Amino acid sequence: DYKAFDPELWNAIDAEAERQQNNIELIASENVVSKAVMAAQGTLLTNKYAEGYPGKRYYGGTAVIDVVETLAIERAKKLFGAKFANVQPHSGSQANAAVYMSLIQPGDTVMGMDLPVSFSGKTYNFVSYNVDKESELLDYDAILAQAKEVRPKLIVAGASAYSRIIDFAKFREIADAVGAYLMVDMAHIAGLVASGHHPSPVPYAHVTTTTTHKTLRGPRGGLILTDDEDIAKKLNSAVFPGLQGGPLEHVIAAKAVALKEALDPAFKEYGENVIKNAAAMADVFNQHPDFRVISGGTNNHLFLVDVTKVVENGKVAQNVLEEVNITLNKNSIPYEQLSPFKTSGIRVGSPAITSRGMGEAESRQIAEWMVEALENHDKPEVLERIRGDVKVLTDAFPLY
Amino acid sequence: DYKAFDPELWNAIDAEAERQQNNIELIASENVVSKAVMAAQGTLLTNKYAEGYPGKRYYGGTAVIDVVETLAIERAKKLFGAKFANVQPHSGSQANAAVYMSLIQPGDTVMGMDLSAGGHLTHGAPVSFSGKTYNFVSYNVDKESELLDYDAILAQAKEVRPKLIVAGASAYSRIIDFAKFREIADAVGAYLMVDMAHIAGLVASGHHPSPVPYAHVTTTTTHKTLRGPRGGLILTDDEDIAKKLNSAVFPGLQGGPLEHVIAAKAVALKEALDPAFKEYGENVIKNAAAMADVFNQHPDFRVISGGTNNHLFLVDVTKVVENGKVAQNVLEEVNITLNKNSIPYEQLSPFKTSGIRVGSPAITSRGMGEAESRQIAEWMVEALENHDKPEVLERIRGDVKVLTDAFPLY
Numbered sequence: 146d147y148k149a150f151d152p153e154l155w156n157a158i159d160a161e162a163e164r165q166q167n168n169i170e171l172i173a174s175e176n177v178v179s180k181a182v183m184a185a186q187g188t189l190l191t192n193k194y195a196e197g198y199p200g201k202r203y204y205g206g207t208a209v210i211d212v213v214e215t216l217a218i219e220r221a222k223k224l225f226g227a228k229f230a231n232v233q234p235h236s237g238s239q240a241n242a243a244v245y246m247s248l249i250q251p252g253d254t255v256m257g258m259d260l261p262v263s264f265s266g267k268t269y270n271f272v273s274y275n276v277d278k279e280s281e282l283l284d285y286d287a288i289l290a291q292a293k294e295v296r297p298k299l300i301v302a303g304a305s306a307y308s309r310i311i312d313f314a315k316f317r318e319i320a321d322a323v324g325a326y327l328m329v330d331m332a333h334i335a336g337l338v339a340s341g342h343h344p345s346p347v348p349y350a351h352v353t354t355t356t357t358h359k360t361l362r363g364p365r366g367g368l369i370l371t372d373d374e375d376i377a378k379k380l381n382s383a384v385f386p387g388l389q390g391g392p393l394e395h396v397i398a399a400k401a402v403a404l405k406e407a408l409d410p411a412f413k414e415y416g417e418n419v420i421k422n423a424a425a426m427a428d429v430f431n432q433h434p435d436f437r438v439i440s441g442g443t444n445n446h447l448f449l450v451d452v453t454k455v456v457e458n459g460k461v462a463q464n465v466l467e468e469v470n471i472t473l474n475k476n477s478i479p480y481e482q483l484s485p486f487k488t489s490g491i492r493v494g495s496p497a498i499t500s501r502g503m504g505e506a507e508s509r510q511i512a513e514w515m516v517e518a519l520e521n522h523d524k525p526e527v528l529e530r531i532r533g534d535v536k537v538l539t540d541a542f543p544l545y
Numbered sequence: 546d547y548k549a550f551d552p553e554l555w556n557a558i559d560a561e562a563e564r565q566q567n568n569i570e571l572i573a574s575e576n577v578v579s580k581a582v583m584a585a586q587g588t589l590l591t592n593k594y595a596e597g598y599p600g601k602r603y604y605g606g607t608a609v610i611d612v613v614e615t616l617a618i619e620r621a622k623k624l625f626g627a628k629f630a631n632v633q634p635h636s637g638s639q640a641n642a643a644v645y646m647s648l649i650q651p652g653d654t655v656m657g658m659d660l661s662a663g664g665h666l667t668h669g670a671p672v673s674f675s676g677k678t679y680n681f682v683s684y685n686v687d688k689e690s691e692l693l694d695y696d697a698i699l700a701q702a703k704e705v706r707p708k709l710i711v712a713g714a715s716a717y718s719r720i721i722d723f724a725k726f727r728e729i730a731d732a733v734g735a736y737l738m739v740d741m742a743h744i745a746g747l748v749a750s751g752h753h754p755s756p757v758p759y760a761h762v763t764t765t766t767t768h769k770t771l772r773g774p775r776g777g778l779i780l781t782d783d784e785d786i787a788k789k790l791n792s793a794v795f796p797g798l799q800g801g802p803l804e805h806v807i808a809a810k811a812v813a814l815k816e817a818l819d820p821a822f823k824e825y826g827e828n829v830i831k832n833a834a835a836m837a838d839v840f841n842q843h844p845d846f847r848v849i850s851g852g853t854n855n856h857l858f859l860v861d862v863t864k865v866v867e868n869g870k871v872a873q874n875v876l877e878e879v880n881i882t883l884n885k886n887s888i889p890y891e892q893l894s895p896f897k898t899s900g901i902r903v904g905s906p907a908i909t910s911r912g913m914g915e916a917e918s919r920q921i922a923e924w925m926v927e928a929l930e931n932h933d934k935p936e937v938l939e940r941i942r943g944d945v946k947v948l949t950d951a952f953p954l955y
C-alpha cells in the first residue's frame with residue numbers, strides 16, 4: 146500500500162486520469178499509450194545502468210538487458226525495413242542531434258521545414274523552407290532553387306504541421322543535386338509510416354529519426370535508422386558517449402512493446418482510422434464558409450484551420466475550445482501575418498481520439514462543436530451547453 | 546492480460562528481475578527504487594505533453610500536471626533548503642548543460658575534479674557555432690594524502706583563471722568542504738557549481754555537508770544515492786540565476802518535460818524527507834566503511850585515502866591481479882558487480898586502471914547491514930586472490946547465493 150504513504154501525489158494522479166477522461170485531446174502530437182507500454186516503463190529495469198551497446202557493455206550484469214535492447218533494435222529494423230537501428234536516444238531531439246554530430250560540422254548549413262532545431266539551433270546554421278503560397282503545397286522546384294543558393298550540407302524533411310504526403314524520393318533527388326545528406330524526421334508520421342499509410346523515408350534518407358511517442362504510440366524517446374553501416378557506426382558513437390551516458394533500459398523495454406504492437410495487423414486499422422478521422426473533421430471546416438483548411442484538406446493525421454474570419458486569432462480559438470473540454474493548439478499558417486504569439490490558425494489532430502475508439506461520426510461531431518463553440522465564443526451559456534454534450538461523448542468512449 | 550501478447554519481452558523482464566535478485570550490486574551509482582517510484586513512472590502522465598513551467602504553459606489541459614510538478618519543486622526546495630528548484634531536466638548531464646549555458650560562454654575555462662581523483666565523464670557538452678565547448682582544466686587530490694588540497698586548488702585557480710569551478714566527484718571518498726570551494730571561487734572571480742549527483746542522498750540524509758548554501762548552482766541526478774528515477778534537478782538561491790536556468794532548460798535544451806518521471810521525482814523526494822531515510826543514509830555510511838575496513842586490514846590491498854566517509858571507496862588491486870579490469874571480470878564470476886576505476890596519479894591505461902570502485906547504496910537498500918557488507922568484501926578478497934581457480938570461484942559463487950537468498954530484493 147505505497148499510495149497511503151503519499152496521498153497528495155497519488156490523488157493528483159487520479160485527478161489527471163480523470164481530467165484525461167473528460168478531455169477531448171486533439172493535440173496532434175499526443176496519443177494514448179497501452180497499459181503494456183506504461184507497465185514496461187514501470188519495471189525494475191530502471192535499476193540497471195548499462196553503458197555501451199549489446200555485447201559491448203562497459204560493466205557486467207547486462208546479459209538480460211542486452212536481450213531487451215536487441216528486441217527493440219530488431220523490431221525497429223523489422224517494422225521500418227532498415228538495416229541499422231539505435232534505440233538509445235532519450236528523446237527525438239537527442240536523436241536529431243546525433244545525426245548532426247555524425248554527418249556535418251559545427252557551423253554547417255541545414256535546411257529544414259517551417260523552422261527539428263531544438264538545442265542544436267546555435268550549433269548549426271538552420272535555414273527554413275516551407276510551402277508555395279497559393280497551393281500551400283511543397284514545391285520541389287522552389288526547394289531545389291533555394292538549396293542551390295544556400296548549399297546546405299544536410300537537408301531535413303519532416304514537419305509538425307504539414308497535412309499532405311511528402312515525396313521522399315524528390316527530397317533525396319534535391320539533396321543529391323546539391324551534394325547534401327538527407328535526413329528525415331518522421332516523428333509526427335511514424336505511426337502512419339508503420340501502418341502503411343504514409344510512404345517510408347527509409348529507402349531515401351541517409352538517416353531517419355523519430356520519436357517513439359506521437360503516432361507510433363510508444364513511450365517518450367527517440368530512434369535512429371539507417372541503411373549505411375559507416376553512418377551507423379558514427380551514429381552509435383555520437384549517441385554514446387557523445388551525447389548521452391547509459392540508456393534508459395526500462396524505456397527501451399517500452400519501445401520494444403510499442404514496436405511489437407505496431408507490427409501487429411491491427412495497427413494498420415488504427416492508422417486507417419487515424420486517416421479517416423482526421424479527414425472527417427477537416428471536411429466540417431472545408432464545408433463551412435467562414436473557416437479555411439490549409440491546403441484544402443489532409444492525407445495524414447492532422448490539419449491546420451485559418452480561424453480569423455470567426456475569432457480574432459488562434460490563441461483566442463485555443464482558449465475558447467478549452468472552455469468546452471477540447472484541447473488543441475494555436476498554430477501559425479503559411480505566410481502567417483499575425484504575431485507568432487497569436488497566429489491565424491489552429492492545428493487539429495486525430496490520433497488520440499482514434500486511440501480511444503472514436504470513428505468518423507464522432508470526429509465529425511467534435512468538429513461541429515468546435516465550429517459552434519468558436520461562433521459563440523462570447524456566449525458562455527452556449528459553451529456550457531457544448532460542454533454538456535462533450536461529456537456525453539467522453540462518457541461513451543472510456544479512455545482506459 | 547497484456548503479457549500474453551508479448552511473452553518474449555515479458556519473459557525477459559522476469560529474467561532481469563531474477564538476475565538482480567541473484568546479483569550483489571556494488572556499483573556505487575546504482576540503487577534500488579521503491580515500488581511507488583516505478584509505479585509513478587508507469588502512469589498515464591506519459592500521455593500529457595506540457596511545454597513551459599507551472600502556471601506558464603503553452604497548451605491548455607495542464608492544471609493537474611501543474612500540481613504534480615509543483616509538488617516536486619516544493620519537495621526539492623524543502624529537502625535541500627534551496628529557494629529555487631527546476632525538476633524538468635531529463636538527466637544529470639542536461640541539468641549540467643543548463644548550468645554551463647547559463648553562467649559561462651563557449652571557450653571559457655572550467656576547472657573540475659579530474660576523471661581519477663574521483664571525477665565525472667561530460668556527455669552532451671553544448672557546442673557553439675564555431676565548434677568551441679569549454680576549456681576543461683582539471684584539478685586533482687594531493688599525491689601523498691590523496692585528499693583535496695584547497696591551497697593547491699586556489700593556487701591553480703589563480704594561474705588558470707577559470708570562470709567556473711565545478712566540485713563533486715564520482716570516486717572521492719572523503720567529505721567535501723563546500724565552503725572552501727566557494728571561498729576559492731570568490732577569490733578568483735569564478736562561479737561555483739556543485740554536481741552533487743553521487744552524494745545527494747547523503748546530503749539529504751544529513752550525512753554529507755550541503756553544497757546548497759555555497760554553490761551558486763547545485764545540480765544532481767534524482768537517481769543514485771537519492772534513490773529516485775533517472776533524471777535531473779537544479780537548485781539555486783539566486784533568482785536572476787534561476788531565471789537564466791529555467792530558460793536554458795526550456796526551450797534552450799529540451800522541449801516538454803517528462804511529467805510521469807516528475808511524478809516519480811515527487812515520490813522519491815517525499816521518501817527522502819521521511820525520518821527513515823536518515824537511517825538509510827547511516828547504514829549506507831556504515832556498510833561502506835565495513836567493506837573498506839576489510840581492504841584496509843589486508844596487506845595486499847590499499848584503499849585510496851585510507852578509508853571513506855561516504856557511500857564508496859576505491860581499492861588498488863594491482864598487488865593481487867594485473868589491473869582493475871581483470872578484477873572486475875573476476876568478481877563477475879562470483880555474482881558481484883562493480884567497476885574498475887582509475888586511482889589518483891593512475892599509471893595504467895584508462896582501459897585497465899589500477900583500481901576498483903565499490904559502493905554500498907544498493908546492498909543497503911536490500912536490507913544488508915555491516916556483517917553482510919564485511920562478508921561481501923572477504924569474498925571479493927578471496928575471489929581476487931584465487932582469480933585463476935574456477936573451483937574456488939564456483940564455491941564463493943555458491944555462498945553468494947545463500948546470502949542473496951536471505952536478503953530478497955523485492
Ligand SMILES: C[As](C)(=O)[O-]
Nearest residue numbers: 173174305594800
Ligand atoms: C511542438 As509538438 C511536440 O506539439 O509538435
Ligand SMILES: C[As](C)(=O)[O-]
Nearest residue numbers: 194574665666715
Ligand atoms: C558514470 As557512473 C553513473 O557509473 O558514476
Ligand code: NA
Nearest residue numbers: 430431433436
Ligand atoms: Na471552408
